[PDB]
Design a binder for these strands. Sequence first.
RNA 1: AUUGAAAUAAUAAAAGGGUUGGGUUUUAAAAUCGUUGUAAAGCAGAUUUGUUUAUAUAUUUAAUUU
RNA 2: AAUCUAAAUAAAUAAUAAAUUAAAAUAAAAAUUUUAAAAAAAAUUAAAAAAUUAAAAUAGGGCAAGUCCUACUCUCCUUU
Lengths: 158, 272, 300, 59, 351
Amino acid sequence: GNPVNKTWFRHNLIIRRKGSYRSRWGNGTEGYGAGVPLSDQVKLHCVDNTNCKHVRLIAKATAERFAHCRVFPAVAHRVSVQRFKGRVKPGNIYWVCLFTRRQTNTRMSGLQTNFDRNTCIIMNDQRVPLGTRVMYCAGRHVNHKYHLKAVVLANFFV
Amino acid sequence: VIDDVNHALVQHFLKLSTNDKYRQARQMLVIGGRAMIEELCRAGHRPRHLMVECGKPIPEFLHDRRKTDVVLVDRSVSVAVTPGSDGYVGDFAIPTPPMKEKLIANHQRLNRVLVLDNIEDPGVLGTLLRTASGYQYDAIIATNHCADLYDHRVVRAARGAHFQTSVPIYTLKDEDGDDVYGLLNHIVERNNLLPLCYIAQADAAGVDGETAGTQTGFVSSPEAPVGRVFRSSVVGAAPVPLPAPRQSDSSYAASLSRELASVSQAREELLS
Amino acid sequence: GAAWYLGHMQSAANMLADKVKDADFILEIRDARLPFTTENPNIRKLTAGKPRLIIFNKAELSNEDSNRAIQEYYERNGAFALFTSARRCWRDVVEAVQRFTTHILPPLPYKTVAHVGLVVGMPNVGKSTLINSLRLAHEYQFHREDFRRSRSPETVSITPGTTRGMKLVPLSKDPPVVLYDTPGLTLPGCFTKESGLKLAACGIIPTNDVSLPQGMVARYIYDILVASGSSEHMAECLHLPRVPISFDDCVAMICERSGTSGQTEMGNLDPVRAHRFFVHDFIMGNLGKITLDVLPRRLL
Amino acid sequence: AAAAAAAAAAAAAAAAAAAAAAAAAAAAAAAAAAAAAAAAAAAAAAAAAAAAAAAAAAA
Amino acid sequence: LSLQAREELSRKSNELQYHVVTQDWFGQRVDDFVTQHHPEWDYETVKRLVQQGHIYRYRKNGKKRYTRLTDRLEFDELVVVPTASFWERQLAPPSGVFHLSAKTREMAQEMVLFKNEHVIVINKPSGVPIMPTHDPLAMNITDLLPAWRYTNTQTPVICHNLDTETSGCVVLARSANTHRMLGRMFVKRVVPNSVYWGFAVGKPPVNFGRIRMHFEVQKGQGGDVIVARPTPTADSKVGIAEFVVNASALEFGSFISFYPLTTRRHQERIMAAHALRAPLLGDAKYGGESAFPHSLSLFWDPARKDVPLHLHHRKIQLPYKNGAGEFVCVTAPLPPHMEKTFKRLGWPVDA
RNA sequence: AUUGAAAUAAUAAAAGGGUUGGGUUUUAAAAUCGUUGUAAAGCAGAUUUGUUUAUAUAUUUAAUUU
RNA sequence: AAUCUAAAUAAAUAAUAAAUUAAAAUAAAAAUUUUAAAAAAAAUUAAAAAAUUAAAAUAGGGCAAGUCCUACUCUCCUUU
């Protein structure tokens, strides 16, 4: 009686925002709360020195952005290397400290920003990275004490 | 069967046998003894965790909710948590005497006190506690840094003494200047509220009244002396009482071979 | 939910006994590349006295040295053994059951009754196709059950499920050596870490999935053949520098029919199209004609 | 909302226990049910006597 | 029944025939006649026989008047009331004819999610069994049971035997009278009454549906399968569940919710190991050979037996209601072993 | 005595939900065409004495401060 | 983004027992309920939605007989 709801569990782990001319995502490029928090298997690029494919790393969680607060997401991520070396496996579930994204994310100072490819680094259960060196430019949103005190804070931010 | 020294019940007894802070914080004390437990069990006392070693001697005169956890323990832990040759070890509920009856119901005549002032040693410390009670001494006392009156070696030496068979024993405090010059004034002068004093059983002795008492006591002489020390210090002389009689022995005796000679007849029995 | 019998075989023993208590000659369909992984656990203590006709299929790809000892082993115990390339199909294996009883059958008391045959073995190594080939043709050309072959309901045409009771296939007629079914008792799915490798290696249980990726058997068929040669001749068959140093180069050296989206300047080939190749080709007995099991020279 | 209107899952007024079975109005709108003592679908929810407390067993 | 009334006719027994004298007992209620003549049976033991038909009838005229407990006697027909004396026989007469130290009487009180005057709900630890298997040795619930006798009730009775590897929520009845009532709540539901959670490795087919398999327990532990879409009709019972894949690891795992309409053995895990062939995480009995834990970034040291079966009896809807009209729903919170993999995956563990 | 038979697998018509038990559920072009609610009758100088409240969450996190 | 107003002219279709109603709550009949009863206070108009009203005593299993079906040894009037 009253099939009140099916799946009901995506609504506990997704950032769903109605489209009603007031609640709406937008393409970014408008103001904080850019939009489109990147919710599906998105095959992010790895950047830090491991055998993570650096070109493919399939997504796990249904939310990724700082106006969605990557600062406390616990964003799981599955590794799917099309090739690693012919050291990680192509089948493990590491967390991720998202670095940047091609989606034009507007900052709270009007500074729009978008990079050539959405990238990230694999890390551990205690939020320590798995690599030694990082080969990309991370985003300001990686400054939290959440992903700092173990993150090398690789190099030049944006 | 517990063949692991990391078991909670094992680590329970260790921090109950050797540590002294987290003893009272749980109000428990380890007892070892095959017959020493029934002795206490006879007068209505049930061990919380009676750990028998896994073996032959399994008397069950209180079983079936003897405050259960009647655990069987390995030989290996029978060595570690149990310094003692018993296959029968447990722990009991700390009793307490009240620190006020030292201050108020100080009865006049038959009041002889013990003190035992030093950093002491178990076994000896426990032994005196058995014999001091063994003659119904009242107000057996602690000092600056004697060993806890519930230590596992002390209760092994006391052999059924610590619990109230007949023991109005007492324990004293810690004071400001890393000393106990305020341990006495709070009570000891008040333990001259009832009148006489002595300071025997010190390796060094002075006035030395020396076991020479003639009159049977003028039996109604309602004052009576008190206990003694262990080492050589004038700390017993800075207190207000002007009594100073530091007693010695007669023959070639040495440490610990002086008290049980003194306390034997220096106790209440001046009637003889 | 169409799974199979699921449980340890060593509890299907005291029921297998009473199945042999009435049978006469025991059969089996094994894989000569797996002499004792495709066997039921009791093969040792199963019968010891009923005349077993133990058959090893796909023998042409199983090595010949290990073929002699395994042949003469049972041939010493008395229970026979027959090896077949399966190219010359089971039609000759059937001929065996026509011959391998006339010499060893006890004479029938009643001129025409049966030779009740108890068959065992993995259904996916040749036991199913051996039944349902002789079970289908009996519906047309008729020996017993004596009815007009019309009562087979809609959408069956074969019944290896939900009845399988007294169901049996009459392989022969005048020496009517009939054969039972033995509702499949093998490959319990509770198999061993390694047995699933040798099983999926032989093409049996060909499922390569999240439970058993190619790179787990391919790592096994490569590290089993540490002796590079006549196997590197399959590598050298595709331009390989003969000796492969390890798993990375040989699998990546054979990416000529493999690959994915890779740049014009740096190609990122696909090592899984090379995985299945190195895996499935060894199945065909193409790479090497070498067994997997160890062949205990002792009795076990 | 002060005026109120937070009605329960149905019951309005429940009378005294009288042993295992306690009554209840179950005001809602109708009923259907059964009855351990004589099992007949019994529309009459205006009064349903539950057993010890199991809403499964009624009148 | 027609044969039950036959042996009743053809049994001398002792057939204690009981006259109904003119004065004291003619007119009294029958349940007064039996209870003051037969003090051996408890009153409830007397209602069962008087209503069941293994009854103390009354015989006046040429037929037997089986009766309700309140039927009163007749005006001295010397109307005998026959009562059974040697039931034991083909009749099969009706029902009624160590020590728990502390650290257990406390351990069994942190495993209590809900208690009232009629039930007790607990939270079973994954790995402790219910029925004893090493008959002197294993620490199970039934040996613990004299610990939830809160308020001195008579040794609660276990109602549905959760398995060994299954964690979760159990129900004891606190009363042998309540246990009779709480039967219709378990066997062969039509609509769900309970939720099983689990972490099957491998995203199954469509994330909503129903599973109908036809189990067959061949001893020992045969555990057969769908073999007949209708049934084998002889040795088989079916187990139906309405599974819902709440959320799913992208392609390698899922968090599935089973609503088990039936009561079959490991029906949770055997239907999960063939909803896809993707069994539950750590299910070494039916699946469990894909790898040791099926080879993840979880705690992966011994593995071979480390990972406990991620199956949890999550919620039970009791029929006892609450102060507000809602029926009560215990919500046994996940063990850390599932709280490990839920937070390791960042899912919002709903307690 | 006076035709004898076959799960004749599908149809039809019935019942039914110690022999005995698997099934649980309700529809496929809707001018709305009655109520319904939603919006509306086009500039009112001006909310809101009293009607009526689809209004809706109170917390799963991260990082501090004693 | 782009195309499909309205008004003006022209005009069909299925449907139609009528209502004095019809908001909203709430119990009462082999009954399935169209009504009636208490208690309420429910305004016109246009527009747009389809929640309710106007289109079968059914779906699925488990049993047993029947028609359909094949088969002839024994049946009836075949004609050719």
